[PDB]
Amino acid sequence: TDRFTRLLGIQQPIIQAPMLGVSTPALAAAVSNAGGLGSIAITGSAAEKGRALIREVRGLTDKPFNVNLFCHRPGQADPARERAWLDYLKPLFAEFGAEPPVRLKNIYLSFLEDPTLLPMLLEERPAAVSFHFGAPPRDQVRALQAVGIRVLVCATTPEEAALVEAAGADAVVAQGIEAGGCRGVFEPERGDAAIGTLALVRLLAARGSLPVVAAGGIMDGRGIRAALELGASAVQMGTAFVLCPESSANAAYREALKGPRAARTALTVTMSGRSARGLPNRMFFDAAAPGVPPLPDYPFVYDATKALQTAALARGNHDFAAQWAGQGAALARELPAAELLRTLVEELRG
């Protein structure tokens, strides 16, 4: 942890996970101010909006923070497949007096397909830039490192970690099956090894090269200590920060995570088009069930789901929301983010 904190310029080996739709400049700044590494996610925003968000964080903290971008294979539009998916969803929209959207859009541009993102990052120079779903080309990773920036990439397997090493990243974020949100699997069509945090962190620390940031299921200082025993250099925690008042989780999401539903999470591909973990609801169904048409590509599926979420929310219905949560959800606490960071550090010290 001394090595990692020195590398990142921070006091504590704790990253508050970037969480699209949940992390905020206020949350990131609170964690960075408290001594960890706060994070924001800027995928889905135009580069100049991402720039504004980065500048917002800087107006709230002097300390290092992490800017996260999705690096998936660029989605492949398929109007016919998307049409059939929308037709399939039509009765759900109709419950709320709505029709499905007339077309789906590539709402989350990959780092690999939006050439305006890299130069913006090279200008703003956040302390850390992180990638999910894949690693950028080595030359782009090097460009970021050429200015101040530390580069992290998420991996879910030793094979993916090898690719992160090849990309020249400064650290690998080892995401275990416990983790909330969309899984960082590079090529899900090849399957999902679905490796638990305890095995994955040990495997990458033992037979790997880079500092390992443990992600998935860690909710308290005991979990941080366990990750460190396995050989991690730091932890990345998402679910633990969702209930912070600084996050942009809405009231229904906070209520869900605080209550009995927190007892069980599940994986779904039907929410976004990519395997993701959260509190199961009506958007969690079997994609291989009879009558269910072929799934469109990521992220077009999520565009469809967001339209349905909008229609449901317009009638006060939250049963289609994306309430992401890891397998430690039952251990969630509701605290100001700075207090949570401090509490984690006290628990880590023992």
Ligand X SMILES: Cc1cc2nc3c(=O)[nH]c(=O)nc-3n(C[C@H](O)[C@H](O)[C@H](O)COP(=O)(O)O)c2cc1C
Sign of CA dihedral 189, 195, 200, 204: negative
Q: Which residues of 309-346 are buried (b: 16+ CB within 10 A; e: fewer)?
A: bebbeeeeebebbbbbbbbbbebbeebebbebbbebbe
x/- string (CB under 6 A) for ligand X, residues 19-38?
xx-x----------------
Is 238 among the residues that bind ligand X (CB under 6 A)?
yes
CB of 15 to ligand X, least distance (A): 8
Q: Tell me: does residue 253 bind ligand X (CB under 6 A).
A: no
Helix-strand-coil split of the chain, %, nearest 5? 40, 15, 45
Rounding to the nearest 10 degrees, give the CA dihedral for residues 53, 55, 58, 63. Answer: 80
Nearest approach, Cβ of 18 to ligand X (angstroms)?
4
Sequence-distant (6+) residues with CB within 8 A of 150 are 7, 8, 127, 128, 129, 170, 171
Q: Write the DSSP string, 49-69.
A: HHHHHHHHHHTT-SS-EEEEE
Q: Per rule CB under 6 A, is residue 169 in the interface with ligand X? A: no
- Letters for 90-129 (x = contact with ligand X by CB under 6 A, - = none) are ----------------------------------------
> Is residue 227 involved in binding a copy of itself (CB under 8 A)?
yes
Query: Contact letters (x/-) for a copy of itself, 153-182, by CB under 8 A?
Result: -----xx----------------xxx----
What span, in angstroms and rounded, lies between the C-alpha atoms of 229 and 65? Answer: 25
Position among 108, 186, 320, 324 found at the interface with ligand X (CB under 6 A): 324
Cα separation, 350 vs 225, whole angstroms:
9
CB of 156 to a copy of itself, least distance (A): 12
Site string for a copy of itself, 302-331 (x = CB under 8 A): ------------------------xxx-xx
**Contact residues for a copy of itself, defined by CB under 8 A:** 158-159, 176-178, 193-200, 202-203, 206-207, 216-220, 222-223, 225-227, 229-231, 263-266, 288, 326-328, 330-331
